[PDB]
Amino acid sequence: MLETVPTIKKLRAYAERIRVAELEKCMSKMGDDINKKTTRAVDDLSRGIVNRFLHGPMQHLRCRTLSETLENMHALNRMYGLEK
Amino acid sequence: MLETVPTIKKLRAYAERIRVAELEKCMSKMGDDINKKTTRAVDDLSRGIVNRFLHGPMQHLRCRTLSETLENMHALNRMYGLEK
Amino acid sequence: PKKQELISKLKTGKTFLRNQEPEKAYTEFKIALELAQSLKDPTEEKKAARGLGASLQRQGKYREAIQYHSMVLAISKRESEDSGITEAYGAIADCYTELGDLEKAGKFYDTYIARLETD
Amino acid sequence: PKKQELISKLKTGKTFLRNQEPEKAYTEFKIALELAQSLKDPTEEKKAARGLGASLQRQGKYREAIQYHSMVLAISKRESEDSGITEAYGAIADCYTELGDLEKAGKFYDTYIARLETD
16 A cells, blocks of 8 residues: 555665665775675675565565554654654 | 563564674675674674664663554564564 | 776765765766766666666656666666666665655565565 | 684684584583683683573573673673673573563663664
8 A cells, every 4th residue: 555655765765874874884994805896795785684674574564454554654663763 | 561572582583694694695705805804894784784773673662652562563573573 | 998987987976976966976977877888888887877866866856867777677687687676676666756656656666675585 | 823723613613503503512612712711812702702602592501691691791891892792781681581581681681772873
């Protein structure tokens, strides 16, 4: 249903803020050890962790009673402060 | 309240399975580029992302009406399949 | 070679984007896009395309942003190389959401959710 | 030096733990603990202590596991070095949860939640 769509967007952005922030700190702490394959590997790590974390919640934000889907949305809103 | 305590434990283990799995794949893809500071940096990255992700939910699993806390628990249970 | 300039243009564009300068960044990624196309390097063409998409969203030009994120899909199909695909699907969905087409955004989110565990 | 053996014992113990062998791993971390203490290396002593804690939990010996995870806290206090602290707090809470003391587990979780954003 359409009502949870913005929550999906907001949760993506929340996740990404964290991913980028930590990925940047990591790269800074590696100095001259950054090369293509190493850089690519750490990038894949950052989004690999984020994506596998986001899968459950976001799968459950779509398509199951509509009522539980809304509660999943509300819980996310509370837990991550998506609706400031 | 005590009822959400096991969910916290289960969510920690769920998070860690993902963190370890991805961290291991990352290290394998770096070859000989693994040295102390580089290894430490990527480890800090893996748990930095996980921890900042887990903070919201787990803070909201403790101490706010008790009713919302239980719903946060239920939503997590559904989203991450904590209660198999 | 000039591959050198391509690397520079991508890094520069990524820097301008990180410093609240999407217009300046758009200029850089645009050059990088031309370079990657002229150099026939699809992998970097997808990166350049994403940079343009990101620069445009940042400017609020979501409809134009979709055109550039869609390239990532198009290039990937022409090349059978799926890097950036998952992010592209999600970005496009983000754009449609900002445009009010929640129906179409949901369809792209669905495609993107289905990839969240694969790598 | 023998620092060489310490590195080996930590890696070996970590390997046995990954391969469903907590007893063999306990033996390795135990040697590493003695080595790190004899070498006066607190940083590695905390790592050795965690390995023992993990090996014990894996065996279901949660009460003994707490004793070794608590060392990480103790060593950290004696040294003003806080690495492993957050994980130690959480592991101890996991142990009390497995022991049925949900009250005490909650207290340790609370301490651990409060660190989840700091680094």
